[PDB]
């Protein structure tokens, strides 16, 4: 007295993975903005979902997409292959003050021209970290014996553009709308969307710049809290602004090294030689560290002493705060911020150095050379997160030291894709019903 | 309700908004071009692999189409009150997940016998 009825369009979904495409609204850019398509949220009731931010597949796909997009604009323009010559570098002095002598050098070298059997003796200005000496003293480039140096492309821009990794038809994206969500566990407030919000691909270590803020309190995220080898992500509830600037003019000079091959170097500086620096507010940082430690004391106890120290040592792109402002890469010491001990109008100025040979994405064999920027560089930025770590103690004291760390670019993008999940819709169903054909 | 709005309701309360989910299943060689092309190819293939299974059983253009096979008591011994008013769609597909292949096999030969029985009806 029962029969089979086939239903098409039942709300049943499985867990799967697919490929996502860009979607943005619209001098070129590094990331393809004009190649994306031009750009609803349905709340669900009586359904739960177990989210896990440490086993997501969107982070690796986003990392592979950013790597594939970074190596597509450096190809068709000029590479600086004959630059590995014997330089002759001296010191530069033009009303220069203290603590700057030794960071800039005036180099002179021979270089080929558009004719094959002729030479030309030219000169330029280089930094301290870009040249090394060999045994007037002779100098050479640092990334010459291990990597090939190509110039950064002068018709692109490194400005971050918010994009939307958006799923095709047949799949769906779920989002947990919890205000105190920690990326792991069940979520009783799940809503479906088309795709995500604007995510800016900001490349920075130890400081989450131009990110997303929280809603209620400062969030602390970690995978294994009993291990001293996992990073700790801190999400603030308020932004802390910071103003970075460089007082140098940095005029540019073009040299033709061959047929249709140009090389942009530093010319002459008109003015004083001062340090590039970032000013950060001192009154907001104290209450920011207080609101961080008030949430951090819940995972270790109410009888814990919290020490904030600087980095120990390693690579220059790990211990120092590395970021990009105005097209120029800055490396700040930032040792004056993480210096505190918490027991149960002024501004801090951090000097930053500038490097022209940048090795991105921890690669050994692919280098770059950024061109000089004309004018004065000054930018503002927000601080909406931190990447910290701790060391292994002797499990008998109550003192915990937290040091800034980074280097891995997956942690900078896992803080934005920690609430989204991709599901696959299956609309077929079979039901019992007392009905017959014809 | 919207797209997937009746996901938490019962099986009797979610069988009336089936047209909402049935209409959202179809819609230089750079990095963002091949991904869009593969996404369109995957969407077309996922639409065709369901339209073919809908067309084999004889439900071309119908969503609550009726069949002629009987329901065996060994698959589910529940009545009409504990299915359309208590269980949802996320649990009913997991309840008879071991018996879907024999139902999909029985839905083919009965349609074939019904199509070959119609040939002996207009030949009089």
């Amino acid at each position: 007295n029962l029969w089979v009825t086939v239903y098409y369009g039942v709300p049943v979904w499985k867990d799967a993975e697919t490929t996502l495409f860009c979607a943005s609204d619209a001098k070129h850019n590094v990331w393809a903005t004009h190649a994306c398509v031009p750009t609803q949220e349905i709340h669900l009731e009586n359904v739960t979902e177990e989210f896990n931010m440490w086993k997501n597949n969107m982070v690796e796909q986003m990392h592979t997409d950013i790597i594939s997009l970074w190596d597509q604009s450096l190809k068709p323009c000029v590479k600086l292959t004959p630059l590995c010559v014997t330089l002759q570098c001296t010191n530069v002095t033009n009303n220069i003050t203290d603590d700057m002598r030794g960071e800039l050098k005036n180099c002179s070298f021979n270089m080929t021209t558009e004719l094959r059997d002729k030479k030309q003796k030219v000169y330029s200005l280089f930094y301290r970290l870009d040249v090394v000496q060999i045994n007037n003293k002779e100098y050479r480039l640092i990334n010459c014996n291990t990597s090939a140096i190509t110039q950064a492309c002068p018709k692109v821009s490194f400005e971050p553009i918010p994009i939307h990794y958006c799923a095709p038809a047949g799949f769906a994206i779920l989002k947990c709308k919890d205000k105190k969500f920690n990326g792991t566990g069940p979520c009783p407030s799940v809503s479906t969307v088309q795709c995500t919000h604007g995510i800016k691909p900001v490349v920075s270590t130890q400081l989450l710049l131009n990110g997303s803020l929280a809603e209620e309190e400062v969030m602390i995220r970690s995978e294994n809290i009993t291990n001293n080898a996992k990073n700790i992500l801190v999400q603030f509830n308020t932004p802390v602004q910071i103003n970075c600037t460089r007082p140098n003019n940095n005029t540019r000079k073009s040299i033709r090294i061959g047929p249709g091959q140009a090389f942009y170097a530093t010319g002459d500086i008109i003015g004083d030689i001062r340090q590039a620096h970032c000013n950060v507010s001192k009154a907001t940082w104290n209450e920011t560290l207080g609101k961080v430690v008030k949430q951090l004391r819940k995972h270790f106890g109410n009888n814990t002493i919290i020490r904030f120290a600087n980095s120990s040592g390693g690579d220059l792109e790990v211990t120092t705060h590395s970021f990009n402002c105005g097209g120029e890469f800055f490396y700040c010491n930032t040792s004056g911020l993480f210096n505190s001990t918490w027991i149960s109008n002024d501004s801090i100025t951090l000097p930053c150095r500038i490097k022209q040979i940048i090795n991105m994405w921890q690669r050994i064999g692919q280098a770059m050379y950024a061109p000089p920027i004309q004018g004065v560089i000054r930018c503002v930025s927000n601080i909406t997160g931190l990447i910290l770590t701790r060391d292994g103690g002797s499990t008998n004291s109550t003192t915990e030291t937290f040091r800034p760390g980074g280097g891995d670019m997956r942690d900078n993008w896992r803080s934005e894709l920690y609430k989204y999940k991709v599901v696959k819709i299956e609309p077929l169903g079979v039901a019992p019903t007392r009905c017959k054909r014809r | 309700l919207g797209f997937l709005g009746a996901a938490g309701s019962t099986m009797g309360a979610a069988s009336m908004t089936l047209t909402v989910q049935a209409r959202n299943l179809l819609s230089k060689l750079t990095v963002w071009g091949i991904k869009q092309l593969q996404a369109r190819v995957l969407a077309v293939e996922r639409y065709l692999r369901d339209q073919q299974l809908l067309g084999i059983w004889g439900c071309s253009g119908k969503l609550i189409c009726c069949t002629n096979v009987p329901w065996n008591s060994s698959w589910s011994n529940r009545n009409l009150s504990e299915i359309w008013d208590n269980m949802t769609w996320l649990q009913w597909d997991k309840e008879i997940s071991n018996y879907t292949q024999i139902i999909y096999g029985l839905l083919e030969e009965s349609q074939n016998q019904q199509e070959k029985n119609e040939q002996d009806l207009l030949a009089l």
Partner: antibody
Amino acid sequence: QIHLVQSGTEVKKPGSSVTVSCKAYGVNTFGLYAVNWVRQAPGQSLEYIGQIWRWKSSASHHFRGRVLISAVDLTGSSPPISSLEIKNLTSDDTAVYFCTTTSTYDRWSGLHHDGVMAFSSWGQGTLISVSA
Amino acid sequence: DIQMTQSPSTLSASTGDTVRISCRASQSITGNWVAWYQQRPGKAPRLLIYRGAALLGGVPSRFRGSAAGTDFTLTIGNLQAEDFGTFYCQQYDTYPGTFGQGTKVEVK
């Protein structure tokens, strides 16, 4: 892998209470898992006592209002702890108690059916012998 | 409340035979919500088979399980010297769960 330890053999007098602890090593979060507590009488069959799921602890219809199950999350200097307290025990509670976990992450895993589930990982069991 | 009955109570076999253990429930479990556990005397219990006819990671392929209406059977072929213990059939369809009765396999 996932290793679980429990308490030792505790001898208790009738009239007082008892508390059995269970420490885990390897699990991530109790929101993705479920901790079930059963027992086993010597020379008899097993018996299901209680369970904690989605931060919702419950017991059976025979041990209602008698036992109490509690659990906490991760701590940077402490393992995951699941405790069970028995108050007003009788002279028929000498048994080997256990502590089981079951991963309830995947919906189509087939190891759980709407709250009641199987036992994928077992412990060592504590002997509780009560006498006057 | 479904009461499980295991068969047989106490049997014996040798190295190389096949042991068939049956389990009969009270109602008709049409969803295959049954599991087979093994417990050594003195040691900890170990889950062998979940969902009637599915193996676990680390269980050899010599064990087999089948389900038909009320009757859930378990076949153990190529019997070794380390498979002597107690076997349990436990359902988890209705609340609460109930174990079987115990089946010891000796050696003779």
